[PDB]
């Protein structure tokens, strides 16, 4: 996963996450298993769009992917009743993901060192060896 | 005979005139007479509601008729 | 004029016309001079559109011209405050007059005998005499 | 006229027509002269559209012309204040009349016997006699 | 006529028709003469659209024509104040009639036996006899 | 008819049909004659659209025709005041019928056995016998 | 000017014109000098559009010009607060004037005798004398 | 039929179906005959769209057809008053059926084993045997 | 300037102009210097559009220019709070001025004598002397 | 099925699912059979769109399919009254499924190991062996 439960607790208060996990667990103690499942689903959703251009798993993880995963996971958790701002943020995130998939914007590089994730050849052509070219220099 | 008939109606497109549905019976007669009076270097004035056009009623060449006539001869 | 004051009093009650003429006259007795002036203005307005196709003055007067003149004259008289129906009728009358001027509709013929007003030649062409025509029958 | 005062009294109650004629007459007795004038104006209005295709006066009168004349005459009478339904019916009638004038719909035939009114030649062409035609059979 | 007064009384209660005929008659007894006049006008209105494709009078009457005539006649009777549903039904009927006139839909056949009304030739072409055709078999 | 009075009483409660037939009958006992007339009119309306593609009368009746006939007949009966849902269902039915007439959808086959109604040749071409074809095998 | 102060007092009550002239004059007695100035401005406004087609001053004055001048002058006088009908009439008058200027409608002729105002040549072409024409008849 | 009464009672509570069947039956005991008739009509409606691509009866039944049949049958039963959600679901179902008929989406396969229903050849071409082809290898 | 302070006092009451000049002056006595400045600004604004077609200063002043100058000057004076009618009149005046500048309408001529202001050549072409023309008559 | 009842109880509280299953079961004890039926219907609905590109059954199951199945199954269960958010989520899910079917987005790969489900050849061409190609190297 691109984000951990601690990263989710960094963006959102532990009290809110506990309230979210209160009904989903069987006992009175809040459980983070549902949070991990939401994170895994968010990572799969991001990978669905990322597979168009870059080979999976990613060699280097861009920094913004963590925030995108946290946003979509929080939207997934707030399924019983979503607020206007949460839905707007999720829509903006999915629009950005579609833009990345279409190639209209670059995902970016990790801040620690300039490095973009590896990807397969989007464009490839084939032809027989070029005889009679100007590089021959034999005539 | 078909060649002669084709030559009869050749190189003279038909002249048509369009008139509004509200035209008087007399107004149609004047337009019909005006259409029949076209020849040489002709002029004329037409209202905005009326239109005048030329459509050719026959087209082609004389090559096939003459080819068949020569073959028969 | 295409209509007289009696024709106007046929469509509209004499009381209404008297009320209309009350302020325009100088004395207490209602005067029909303003009604005649309105009729003359209405006739001129109708002739403005009729001059496009028919020569003036008209040889035969179509029957509907009387009603059109009465309608536009009544609209002219009710200038201080026009009602919705009067304005709508005047607009319909002027639309019909424009349609007549454009040639999209026929003014009609008088009911007593089928006769349309005379008019000038809308379409005219000129050319020299047609020698070598098929009517020659000389060759 | 295509309709009589009795035909108008068939569609509409005599009381309504009397109320309509109350102000237009000079005395207390209702007068049908205004009704006849309205019928004549309606007939002229119908003839204005009918003159496009059929020669006037009509050899045979289609049955629907009576109802159309009655409708437009009733609209003409109710000029002081027209109701929604009366105005809608008059608009539908004039739309039908314009459709008839444009040739998009047939006026119909009288129910007593199948017969359409006579009309002038809408389409006419002229040409010299066709020599060398296949009907010659001389060569 | 395509429908009788009994057919109208089948669709609509006799009480409603009596109420409709109360003001149009001169005496206290309801009269069906106005109903017959409405039926005749409805039949003429239907024939106006039917004359485009089929010769009149019709050899066989399609079954739906009875209902269409009843609907338009009832609309004609309810001229003083039409309800929303009556106006909607009349508009649907006239739209169907225009569709029939344009040839976009078939009027149908009578249910007793499959038979369509006779009509004139909508499409007709003319040409001289075809010599030199492949049916000659003389060469 | 494609449906019987019992089929109509299956879709709709007998009480509702009795209430519908209360005013149309002359006596106090409800009569199903008006229901049969409505069914016949509905069948004629359906046949009007069905005649475009299939020959009438139908060799095999598709199952859905019964429900369509019941729906349009119920709409016909509820002419005094139609509800929103009844009008919507009737509009959907007529839209489906127009789609069937245009050939954009198949009416279907009867559920008891796979069989489509017979119809005339929609597309037909004519030409003289094809000499010199590759099926000759004489040269 | 195309209209006089008496003509303005014919269309509008003397009381209204006096009320209009009450503030514009210096003394208590109403003055018609402002009315004459408004008439002159109206005549100039009309001449501005009339100069396109007809030479000024006009040889013959069409009858409707008087009413148009009166209308625009009355609009000019009612500048402190214009009513809806006055503004609508002024807009209609200026629209008619623009239509006249563009040549889409004829101003008309005076009712006393059929006579249109003289105007310059809108269309003019120039060419050298036509030798070798069919009118030569010398060869 | 693609669904049984037990399948309908699985989606919807037995109490609701009993309430639906209360008025349609003659006695006090609820009857499932109307439910079976609704199921048959739903199956016919589905087959109407399915006949475009697949031969009937279907060799293998896709799983979703059961739910579609249940939905449309429940909509058919709730004809007296339909709720917003029921109408929306029925509209979505018919839109999906039209999409299937047009070939824009696949009906699917049964979950027990991968198998699609058999269908006739949508595309077929005809030509004479190809002499002189590269498969000849005789020259 | 095209208008004087007396001309402004003719259109508008002296009391209104005094009220306008009350705050702009330093002493209690109203001053017309601000009125003259507004007139000069109005004349400059008019000349800005008039310079397109006519040479300045104008040889002859059209009559309507006085009213246009008065209108725009009054709008300029009423800058603290403009009413709807004043703003509408100013917008109409500037629209007329733009139409004059574009050549879509003629400014007009002075009423005292038919005379249009002089202007420079809008269209000018240049070419060498035309030898070999048909006016040579030397060959 | 792509999801189990435990997975549904992970997203949604057991209390909500019990409330959903309360009316559908016959006894007082909640039953998960209806939940399993909803899951099966959801899996069939997903397979309907997945069959376009990938062969069924899937060799490897993408992770997001579990969440999509849970969402559509929960929408199916909440058929009596759907909330705004549930309907919006279902619409988003079906839009994503249509996008997957059209090939505009990739379903993704399972997070445990990079592996995409196998599918048939979307694009296939056929041609005879290429003699005289540059790979011959025989001339």
Swiss-Prot record, chains A, C, D, E, F, G, H, I, J:
Disulfide bonds: none annotated. InterPro entries: Phage_Mu_GpJ. Disruption phenotype: Accumulation of unattached tails and full heads. Its main location: host cell. The keyword Lipoprotein does not apply. It is found in: Host cytoplasm. Keywords: Host cytoplasm, Late protein. GO terms for cellular component: host cell cytoplasm. Residues 101-139 are annotated as: Disordered. Induction: Expressed in the late phase of the viral replicative cycle. Expression of late genes is activated by the viral late transcription activator C. It comes from the Viruses. This is Gene product J. It comes from Escherichia phage Mu (Bacteriophage Mu). The gene is J.
Swiss-Prot record, chain B:
It is found in: Virion; Host cytoplasm. It comes from the Viruses. Induction: Expressed in the late phase of the viral replicative cycle. Expression of late genes is activated by the viral late transcription activator C. Cleavage by the viral I protease yields a C-terminally cleaved portal protein competent for DNA packaging and procpasid maturation. Forms the portal vertex of the capsid. This portal plays critical roles in head assembly, genome packaging, neck/tail attachment, and genome ejection. The portal protein multimerizes as a single ring-shaped homododecamer arranged around a central channel. Binds to the terminase subunits to form the packaging machine. Acts as a linker between the capsid and tail. Required for attachment of the neck proteins to the capsid. Homododecamer. Part of the immature prohead complex. Might interact with viral I protease; this interaction gives rise to an early 25S initiator complex. The scaffolding protein Z and the capsid protein T should then be added to this initiator complex to yield the immature prohead. Host GroEL and GroES are also essential for the correct assembly of viral head and tail. This is Portal protein. The chain holds residues 221 to 293 of 512 of the full protein.
């Amino acid at each position: 996963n691109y984000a951990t439960v601690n990263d989710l607790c960094a963006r959102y208060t532990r009290t809110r996450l506990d309230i979210l996990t209160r009904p989903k667990t069987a006992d009175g103690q809040p459980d983070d298993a549902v949070a991990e499942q939401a994170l895994a689903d968010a990572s799969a959703f991001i990978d669905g769009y990322l597979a168009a251009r870059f080979v999976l798993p990613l060699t280097v993880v861009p920094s913004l992917l963590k925030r995108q995963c946290c946003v979509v996971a929080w939207f997934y958790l707030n399924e019983s009743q979503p607020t206007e701002q949460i839905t707007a943020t999720y829509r903006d995130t999915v629009r950005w993901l579609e833009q990345v998939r279409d190639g209209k914007t670059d995902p970016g590089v990790e801040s620690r060192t300039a490095a973009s994730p590896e990807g397969e050849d989007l464009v490839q052509v084939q032809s027989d060896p070029p005889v009679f070219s100007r590089k021959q220099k034999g005539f | 005979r078909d060649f002669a008939e084709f030559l009869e109606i050749y190189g003279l497109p038909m002249r048509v005139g369009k008139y509004p549905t509200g035209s008087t019976n007399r107004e149609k007669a004047t337009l019909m007479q005006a259409v029949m009076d076209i020849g040489r270097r002709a002029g004329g004035i037409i209202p905005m509601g009326m239109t005048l056009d030329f459509q050719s009623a026959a087209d082609g060449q004389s090559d096939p008729f003459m080819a068949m006539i020569g073959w028969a001869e």
